Design a protein around this ligand. Structure first.
Ligand SMILES: Nc1ncnc2c1ncn2[C@@H]1O[C@H](COP(=O)(O)OP(=O)(O)NP(=O)(O)O)[C@@H](O)[C@H]1O
Ligand SMILES: Nc1ncnc2c1ncn2[C@@H]1O[C@H](CSCC[C@H](N)C(=O)O)[C@@H](O)[C@H]1O
Ligand SMILES: [Mg+2]
Ligand SMILES: [Zn+2]
Ligand SMILES: [Zn+2]
Ligand SMILES: [Zn+2]
Ligand SMILES: [Zn+2]
Ligand SMILES: [Zn+2]
Length: 1880
DNA sequence: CAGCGCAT
DNA sequence: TGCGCTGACA
């Protein structure tokens, strides 16, 4: 609107200050003293930002300089004060605005400091949560509330300290006049005025009011009026849409916000919420507005299952609450009715409000009043405005502002209520201009000028002396013209072959399974695949990483061009020549304005290169100071497309911004050559002529966009011609290019704006041209009457700021209609011309490279953090014109990285490319030993120490100092550049030693003497392609090593494999010669992305660890090897160390699971009979009864591993350490317990060092005072404050060896303790070693002691967050992860040995028991399965009593955490009559008829309840009627009286129809019959009003009763829907005759009685029976078989084929489930000798299985109990004595199936197929379970059974896993016979 | 933290 | 024209 488009906050502020010059006269009044400003309530501290930008504009314009002195501010928020103290850091920060009235006010930290009152301007805004808050329905009144809390707090201070200016702000509807009375009551005068934001440069529309009051004046000059006039003087009304203020969808901010905002309501998605009371308003609105009950934008069924379009932020809508979504759809319809098309017209809605409160939409280019609770929906981007965009719609710049720990709710709150920085800037500047005099002077000017110059000088010296490596240079001369030769057809091929095939990829990478439509040419992923479904035949194309295509395309094209031209008169030649042809004669004014503005890009202003882009088809954009040129590189006819930039300051409605809007003078490449630029440069003159054009219709008449959309008003049944024939006259056609007179067909599927994509029918008058389309395209800002149809050759979404090439537009009056032979007028523009003879032609650079890496390695003496070792420096000639801003005329301007410095680097990339890559630095070079760690500060700041106060965490001030001292780290890869007199230069260098100190930082320190040794290297030309493979680790073998050939004193020999392994273990423990066995390092990266470099600095230290992980396949003798190792090593004298701290023993403790405590000593005694004493501990008491003098004798001690959780252990250790009584008392969690246990271990080792002398006391006594003195701190508390000896703790000794066993089952609480046990050699035994990923190897290393790397987030598939923040986090590349993998593989090669056992083979016959489920349980499980199918495999659990269908559910979904798990677990058990304990074997038919009878009872119960509620409501209504409340006039749509009109009309009732008939019968069986509104109820029961409270109260009670009615109606519909299905399945099972009876079809039309035998399938959730062909055809289109009367939402999934559930085999054995019943007969069939061991997986079924076996004549033994009992039961089950429990029930995935050496049994049962995800993990645990019986001492043949269901998921996952195994590695299948045992 | 609600 | 509040919910 007649104003220049302003979008940059800096520009609008310097404009603001440029409009008034009466402010520079302030800095003379201040006389050199800085303003002293204070702010009472300030969220984003918008006043401070405004003042800082005003100061910047002052210094930039007038040369002057005024500073500021923030005295204080206050915010009782928890995090807004954190944000303040991290950005501005004021000296004092109170937390209140009413305490400051006192002399000793409180501080945000609690210091209770005194208040300073030397302010110069106090700017504060009272809060709004009570000042009528028109969102809020409650309101506080008359100074009882806000004006007594905050305002009366502010008044006392402002009176007690008299600041010369105070400016207030609050909402419009406020008691302001009373505020003026309060202020003028004492001193002030206080005029107040209101003003919006949309009047100050910003489109935001939010409105507020301001106030200003200077202390009393003598003569009362009436300042506030002059203030108001000065403010309202300066204004400028929003010359730009909001889209200019939004971020582009590509930058990492938008990705980082979508990843967080996409999953807000998360493993199991939360419960289906309730909105019924608003659902009523939605239905009423859809009815009143004549809209149709569709859901266009998002075809949602439930809350979380929906499918937005392929341009919508789908991962947002999936997360939305359902009311929000339905509101989106009602807004779309209510808008699409008016004619405009949301989704193509930019405008912000508000959604967090209600349908009723949606006035003011259909209004574009203005945001609404942002509030912290709204959710705005842009409707054109298709998603919400994120945090930083909600900031930018205020004045606040997200730049230069550090937002750490800020989420979308927090950004919403901050930028929601903060006053617009431009409004506040203007009001404050007018204050400071009108009351300039009142502020005093400084009286010290020259000292201030000197201070300013001094600080500027030291800063300009710093960045200059940053670089310290100019010693070495070579000065290789540089040839900028580094073009190459290429066939230019293969490169266009490779350009088409590597380009964005979905919005998912986005300029970086590749996503698979692209679907390319046929006849529309629109590619898109399979995910987010088109809901506007196209033809979509799969795409056939290979994929080349964009990295390769860019690497070649750079080298192919020049780095600069310039259009030769000499076209001053060529334009007039072209004009006359074109006039000779037929084209619109151009005016004089248009020609002049166009030519004179074009003649500056043709001037010899050379084009540079920048940001070759990938959006689609790889445009490569060049740029000059005034023009822009960009080779398009289309997949057909590549062209160049020059364009000219309109000037900076020029209003929007200007002729030049119309003439230079579209490109001019394109050039089409000569294909099939070697030169990338050959064409003749045709031109585009501003010619605009109009032509008549006849439009006609053909083909049939498809439904219009309205009718297809679902409208029901006068739009229902409206059509449009399916094909259009365009007829242009001969000459008027042959004047222009791209003839148009063909015919165009419609594509209702291939969407566009208003679904009007007309693809031209192929014609052979031209083949060299691309395909042409004819559609609509709205303006996106202007009203929709002006939009027009258009002819173009492109069709896609366009981002703000880029237009599309069109051939011609059509009159703004023609629409797809019904009439034919309509004659309209087309208009052509920019009619091109023949080709001029102008063309483009391309065109002492020098760069320093380090000669060799030796020169550098000396310069970094020590503390290389202070300086930078220079790497490159390029001196390049640049003309003094068009030298960019970054080029500074002296003193080496510094570029900032990961900040505003990204266009700076993209500007000079034309020099960056074409530079030889640095070589000879690939190797790791520098080495310097740093014995101690001594982490360099400013490089690795110490974290705040977390301390315990509970019986605070992350001390505030320390957190602030941390998050500040992390942004001032040395920042490797510093890049500075400076422009000389002619030739500029820049110096890229990195702080090598900073990298090295950061790498050293990450090693955790030990009490050792091994010294680190740093390094460094720089590798060029790295690019990110994709994580294409996944590494698979390899565990070596122990075969090749020789053998020790015997251990002495064994009763039985070891085999040769075991001998080789024992010898390897001996040697590995010894390690003769070598002094360290492994090196561990943490390579730290720092990428300079734009140049191809990435740096790496490492820090490695050797570590001597003896012992390693032996993980041998099941059956091998790991126990035997360990006992042999102990027996062998026994004789040796002692190890190498000295162990002075704590006590050393000779015993070798073995940590085993709870139930192996009898298996281990038995094996030890069996092999070496009484060779050495072996003391066992199982219970805590067995530990406490021992003494150290007794442990000394013990050669080997066996320890159960649950004492570490016995929790008496932790108490006794709390005593030996002398800690508080509950220092180590923590719940199951082993977090925060590691630090506490570490401190306890330090204190314990000191105490034991003391106790070695027997001087027991006086130390535990000395530490109590230490702790109770340390506690005394000013922080947050709960209040003002607060030899031999029995029972030794095992953490105070040191053994010769510690051999864990089954280590991968050591849970958190006991892992965190076994990790601390101290010994010389530490061996680990396992059978299933986790080697899948890097975390599973790190978890092994931590047992060993190695570090082996730190934990990053990306390596996969709150406390310390200060280092996990996108501003303080690392960006570790892919090569980093590959090096970490190589390191894990090296550790595995060194310390891990797996090898195959070659004892002998075990027969291993296999069986399988598969059966069908009954009809009743079949139906139940099918209902559950279809539920989860329609919910997309996610567990969702869900007044009026629940039905039976919802009762079979909410029981399966109770504890299930995964969809597949609720199915594995359902098929097992099916108990009928869930309410009563009564039970007996009921036949199948009995079960089904019981189900159906219970459902009939439920239905009639709901019926009677509904009628009861109607009677109560009609009594209420008669009450109100007689008591004269509706007045029978001035209607207000009485709710109940309307619901009774709705319900009567049967055709209006959505949902099933039979339920509607039930409702009508029940309602007419009452006082209402054909809209009666009776006077009395049908029971004559009393209305239950309390005491006749009020009339409106009764109206409210009625308004609630009616919603209760409506809810009950929905519930009744569901009831009938479920009853029908169970009844029909009962009939299908009932018998053949009744099956024929019920097989009366859905009126589908055909059935076995009339037509031949046709498999006709029953549908679930409606109960309708129809033919499978009709069933599929109907369900695919999302509509039931009954056309428009079933009204149920149908998925293709829930289609149950008849006769797919069984009755045949009389499988009546539904007692305790039909699975567990088939188990018991099996177990009886097993002979009486053999033992059995069942393998269930889900613990929650142990009860049901032990209730089935028990009371099923079979006794068993479960392995549950305590650490003492499990060993005994396992021992008796292994034992030789007869008549134990025959079957033993094992839990899989539990420490009970760890390794048991039980071979008494010979066959498993293994009921439910294993579910676990990983195939390798599946295989490992299944072979472990099998091998539990297939062992060495077997002496028998083994069987394996399986109980799988034919219907369920069991057979599915069984087939998947078994086939995938049979294809993969050997895993030799088991013979698989069939069972005919029958032993009893 | 999702519903619910008409005025200065 | 709206810088929510208040019962339920994990
Ligand atoms: N040299 C040997 N002479 C006699 N028996 C042996 C010998 N080596 C192993 N065994 C027996 O072979 C069986 C193997 O069990 P064991 O080696 O203790 O299993 P594990 O490897 O510790 N557990 P797991 O593999 O997970 O099932 C035991 O009964 C051993 O006593
Ligand atoms: N004692 C107090 N009374 C009112 N608000 C307080 C307060 N202490 C802190 N606040 C916070 O201060 C804010 C009030 S409004 C602050 C924003 C203001 N428009 C500006 O930009 O300066 C709220 O976030 C509120 O939570
Ligand atoms: Mg074992
Ligand atoms: Zn298509
Ligand atoms: Zn995609
Ligand atoms: Zn350092
Ligand atoms: Zn149906
Ligand atoms: Zn049918």
């Amino acid at each position: 609107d007649d104003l220049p488009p302003i979008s940059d906050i800096e520009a609008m502020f310097d404009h603001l200050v440029s409009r008034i010059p009466d402010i520079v006269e302030l800095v003379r009044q201040l006389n050199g003293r800085k303003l002293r400003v204070a702010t009472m309530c300030s969220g984003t501290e918008s006043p401070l930002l405004a003042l800082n930008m005003i100061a910047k504009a002052i210094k930039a314009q007038h040369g002057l300089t005024l500073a500021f002195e923030h005295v204080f501010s206050c915010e009782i928020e928890p995090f807004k004060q954190a944000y303040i103290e991290r950005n501005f850091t004021p000296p004092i920060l109170f937390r209140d605005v009413t305490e400051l009235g006192k002399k000793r006010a409180h501080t945000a930290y609690g210091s209770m400091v005194d208040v300073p009152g030397d302010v110069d301007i106090l700017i504060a805004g009272t809060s709004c949560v009570d000042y009528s808050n028109l969102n809020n329905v409650q309101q506080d009144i008359d100074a009882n509330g806000e004006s007594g809390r905050t305002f009366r707090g502010m008044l006392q201070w402002v009176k007690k300290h008299q600041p010369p200016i105070v400016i207030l702000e609050n909402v419009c509807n406020a008691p302001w006049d009373k505020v003026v009375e309060y202020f003028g009551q004492i001193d002030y005068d206080a005029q107040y005025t209101r003003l919006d934001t949309k009047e100050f440069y910003i489109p935001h529309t939010r409105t507020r009011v301001y106030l200003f009051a200077t202390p009393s004046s003598s003569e009362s000059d009436d300042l506030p009026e002059k203030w108001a006039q000065t403010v309202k003087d300066l204004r400028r009304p929003w010359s730009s849409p909001f889209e200019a203020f939004l971020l582009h969808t590509d930058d990492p901010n938008i990705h980082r916000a979508r990843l967080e905002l996409a999953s807000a309501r998360a493993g199991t998605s939360r419960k289906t919420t309730d909105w019924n009371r608003c659902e009523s308003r939605h239905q009423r609105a859809r009815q009143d507005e004549a809209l149709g009950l569709l859901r266009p934008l998002t075809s949602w069924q439930e809350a979380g299952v929906c499918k937005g379009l392929d341009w919508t932020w789908n991962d947002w809508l999936l997360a939305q609450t359902e009311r929000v979504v339905d509101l989106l759809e009602i807004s779309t319809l209510r808008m699409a009715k008016d004619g405009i098309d949301s989704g193509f017209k930019a405008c912000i809605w508000n959604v967090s409000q209600n349908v009723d409160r949606q006035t003011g939409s259909s209004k574009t280019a203005l945001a609404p009043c942002l509030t912290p609770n709204m959710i705005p929906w842009v409707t054109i981007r298709g998603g919400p405005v994120t945090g930083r965009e909600a900031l930018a719609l205020q004045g606040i710049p997200v730049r230069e502002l550090l937002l750490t720990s800020e989420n979308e709710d927090q950004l919403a709150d901050l930028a929601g209520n903060a006053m617009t920085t431009t409004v506040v800037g203007s009001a404050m500047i007018a204050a400071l201009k009108v009351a300039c005099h009142k502020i005093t002077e400084g009286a010290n000017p020259e000292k201030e000028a000197a201070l300013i110059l001094e600080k500027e000088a030291v800063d300009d010296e710093q960045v200059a002396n940053r670089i310290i490596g100019e010693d070495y240079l070579e000065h290789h001369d540089l040839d900028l013209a580094k073009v190459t030769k290429s066939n230019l057809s293969e490169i266009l091929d490779l350009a088409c072959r590597s380009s964005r095939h979905c919005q998912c990829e986005g300029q970086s990478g590749t996503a698979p399974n692209i679907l390319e439509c046929q006849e529309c040419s629109y590619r898109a992923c399979k995910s987010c695949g088109g809901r506007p479904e196209h033809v979509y035949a799969p795409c056939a194309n290979q994929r080349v990483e964009p990295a390769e295509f860019e690497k070649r395309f750079k080298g192919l094209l020049p780095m600069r061009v310039r259009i030769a031209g000499l076209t001053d008169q060529c334009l007039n030649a072209v004009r006359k020549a074109a006039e000779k042809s037929n084209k619109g004669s151009v005016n004089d004014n248009d020609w002049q304005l166009w030519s004179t503005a074009l003649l500056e890009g043709i001037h010899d202003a050379e084009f540079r290169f920048r940001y070759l882009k990938r959006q689609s088809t790889w445009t490569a954009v060049y740029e000059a100071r005034r023009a822009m040129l960009s080779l398009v590189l289309r997949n057909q006819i590549p062209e160049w497309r020059l364009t000219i930039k309109a000037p900076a300051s020029e209003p929007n409605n200007s002729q030049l911004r119309a003439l230079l809007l579209h490109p001019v003078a394109r050039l089409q490449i000569d294909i099939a050559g070697q030169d990338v630029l050959c064409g003749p440069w045709e031109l585009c003159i501003p010619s605009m002529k109009t032509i008549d054009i006849e439009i006609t219709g053909k083909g049939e008449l498809l439904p219009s966009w309205q009718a297809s959309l679902g409208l029901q008003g006068p739009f229902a049944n409206t059509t449009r011609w399916s094909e259009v024939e365009i007829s242009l006259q001969a000459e008027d056609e042959n004047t222009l290019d791209r003839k148009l007179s063909g015919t165009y067909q419609l594509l209702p599927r291939c969407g566009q704006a208003m679904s009007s994509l007309h693809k031209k029918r192929p014609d052979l008058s031209d083949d060299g041209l691309p395909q042409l389309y004819f559609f609509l395209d709205p303006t996106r800002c202007g009203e929709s009457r002006e939009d027009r149809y258009v002819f173009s050759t492109s069709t896609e979404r366009l981002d703000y700021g880029t237009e599309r090439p069109v051939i011609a537009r059509l009159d703004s009056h023609w629409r797809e209609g019904n009439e034919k032979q309509r004659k309209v007028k087309l208009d052509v523009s920019g009619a091109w011309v023949k080709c001029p003879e102008a063309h483009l032609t391309a065109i002492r650079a020098t760069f320093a490279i380090p000669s060799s890496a030796s020169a550098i390695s000396a310069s970094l003496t020590t503390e290389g953090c202070s300086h930078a070792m220079a790497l490159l420096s390029c001196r390049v000639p640049l003309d003094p014109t068009h030298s960019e801003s970054m080029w500074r005329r002296g003193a080496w301007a510094e570029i900032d990285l990961s900040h505003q410095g990204n266009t700076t680097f993209a500007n000079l990339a034309w020099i960056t490319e074409r530079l030889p890559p640095l070589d000879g630095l690939k190797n790791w070079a520098h080495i310097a030993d740093d014995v101690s760690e001594h982490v360099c500060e400013r490089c690795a700041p110490r974290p705040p120490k977390i301390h315990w106060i509970k019986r605070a965490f992350e001390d505030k001030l320390e957190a602030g100092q941390y998050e500040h001292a992390l942004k001032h780290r040395p920042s490797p890869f510093v890049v500075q550049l400076r422009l000389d007199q002619d030739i500029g230069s820049f110096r890229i260098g990195l702080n090598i030693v900073s990298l090295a100190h950061r790498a050293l930082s990450r090693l955790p320190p030990t009490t050792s003497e091994h010294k680190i040794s740093l390094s460094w290297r720089l590798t060029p030309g790295h690019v990110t392609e994709s994580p294409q493979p996944r590494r698979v680790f390899i565990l070596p073998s122990n075969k090749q090593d020789p053998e020790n050939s015997q251990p002495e004193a064994f009763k039985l020999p070891l085999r040769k494999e075991q001998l080789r392994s024992l010898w390897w273990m001996l040697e590995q423990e010894k390690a003769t010669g070598k002094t360290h066995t492994f090196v561990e390092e943490e390579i730290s990266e720092s990428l300079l992305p734009a140049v191809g470099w990435r740096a790496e600095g490492k820090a490695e230290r050797p570590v001597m660890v003896r012992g390693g992980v032996i993980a041998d396949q099941v059956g091998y003798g790991k126990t035997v090897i360990s006992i042999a190792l102990v027996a062998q090593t026994l004789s040796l004298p002692a190890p190498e160390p000295a162990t002075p701290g704590l006590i050393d023993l000779k015993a070798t403790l073995i940590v085993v699971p709870g139930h192996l405590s009898k298996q281990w000593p038995n094996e030890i005694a069996r092999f070496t009979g009484s060779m050495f004493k072996v003391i066992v501990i199982q219970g805590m008491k067995d530990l406490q009864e021992k003494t150290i003098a007794e442990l000394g004798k013990a050669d080997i001690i066996v320890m159960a591993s649950e004492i570490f959780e016995s929790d008496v252990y932790w108490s006794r250790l709390e005593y030996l350490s002398a800690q508080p009584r509950e220092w180590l008392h923590d719940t199951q969690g082993g977090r925060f317990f590691c630090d506490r246990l570490d401190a306890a271990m330090e204190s314990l080792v000191s105490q034991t060092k003391i106790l070695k002398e027997k001087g027991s006391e006086a130390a535990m006594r000395a530490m109590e005072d230490k702790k109770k003195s340390l506690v005394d701190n000013v922080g947050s508390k709960k209040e003002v404050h607060t030899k031999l000896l029995p029972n030794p703790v095992l953490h105070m000794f040191r053994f010769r060896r510690v051999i864990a066993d089954e280590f991968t089952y050591l849970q958190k609480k006991s892992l965190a303790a076994v990790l601390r046990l101290s010994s010389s050699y530490r061996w680990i035994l396992s059978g299933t070693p986790p080697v899948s990923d890097f975390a599973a190897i790190r978890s092994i290393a931590t047992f060993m002691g190695i570090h082996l790397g730190v934990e990053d987030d990306g390596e996969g598939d709150d406390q310390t967050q200060a280092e996990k923040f996108h501003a303080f986090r690392e960006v570790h590349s892919r090569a980093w992860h590959n090096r970490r993998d190589e390191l894990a593989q090296e550790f595995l090669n060194v310390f891990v040995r797996q090898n195959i056992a070659e004892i002998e083979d075990i027969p291993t016959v296999e069986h399988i028991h598969t059966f069908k489920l009954p009809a009743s349980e079949g139906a139940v499980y099918l209902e559950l399965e279809h539920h989860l199918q329609a919910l997309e495999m996610q567990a969702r659990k869900e007044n009026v009593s629940q039905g039976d269908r919802n009762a079979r559910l909410e029981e399966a979904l109770s504890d299930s955490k995964t969809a597949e798990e609720a199915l594995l677990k359902r098929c097992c058990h099916f108990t009928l009559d869930l309410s009563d304990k009564t039970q007996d074997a009921k036949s199948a038919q009995e079960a089904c008829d019981h189900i159906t009878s219970a459902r009939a009872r439920q239905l009639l119960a709901c019926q009677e309840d509904l009628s009861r509620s109607v009677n109560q409501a009609i009594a209420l209504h008669g009450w109100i009627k007689k008591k004269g409340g509706f007045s029978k006039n001035d209607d207000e749509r009485q709710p109940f009286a309307e619901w009774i009109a709705f319900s009567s009309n049967i055709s209006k009732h959505q949902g099933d129809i039979e339920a509607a008939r039930i409702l009508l019968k029940v309602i007419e069986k009452c006082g209402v019959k054909d809209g009666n509104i009776p006077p009395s109820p049908s029971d004559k029961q009393s209305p239950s009003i309390a005491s006749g409270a009020k009339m409106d109260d009764v109206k409210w009670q009625l308004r609630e009763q009616t919603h209760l009615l409506r809810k009950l109606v929905k519930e009744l519909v569901a009831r009938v829907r479920s009853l029908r299905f169970f009844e029909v399945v009962r009939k299908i099972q009932k018998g053949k005759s009744d099956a024929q009876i019920v097989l009366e079809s859905s009126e589908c039309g055909h059935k076995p009685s009339t037509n031949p035998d046709i498999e006709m399938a029953i549908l679930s959730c409606c109960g309708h029976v129809a033919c499978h062909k009709c069933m599929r055809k109907a369900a695919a289109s999302q509509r039931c078989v009954k056309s428009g009367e079933c009204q149920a939402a149908v998925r293709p999934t829930n289609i149950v084929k008849v006769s797919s559930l069984g009755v045949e085999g009389e499988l009546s054995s539904g007692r305790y489930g039909a699975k567990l019943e088939h188990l018991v007969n099996l177990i009886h069939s097993i002979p009486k000798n053999e033992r059995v061991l069942v393998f269930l997986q889900w613990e929650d079924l142990a009860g049901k299985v032990s209730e089935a076996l028990s009371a099923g004549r079979i006794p068993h033994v479960t392995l549950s109990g305590s650490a003492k009992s499990r060993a005994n039961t396992l021992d008796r089950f292994q034992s030789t004595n007869a008549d134990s429990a025959r079957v033993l029930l094992l839990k899989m995935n539990d420490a009970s199936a760890a390794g048991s050496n039980l071979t008494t049994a010979n066959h498993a049962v293994f009921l439910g197929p294993l579910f676990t995800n990983s195939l390798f993990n599946y295989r490992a645990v299944e072979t472990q379970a099998i091998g539990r019986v297939r062992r060495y001492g077997q002496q028998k043949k083994v069987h394996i059974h399986r109980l799988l269901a034919l219907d369920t998921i069991d057979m599915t996952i069984f087939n998947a896993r078994r086939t995938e195994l049979k294809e993969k590695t050997d895993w030799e299948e088991i013979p698989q016979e069939e069972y005919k045992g029958r032993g009893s």
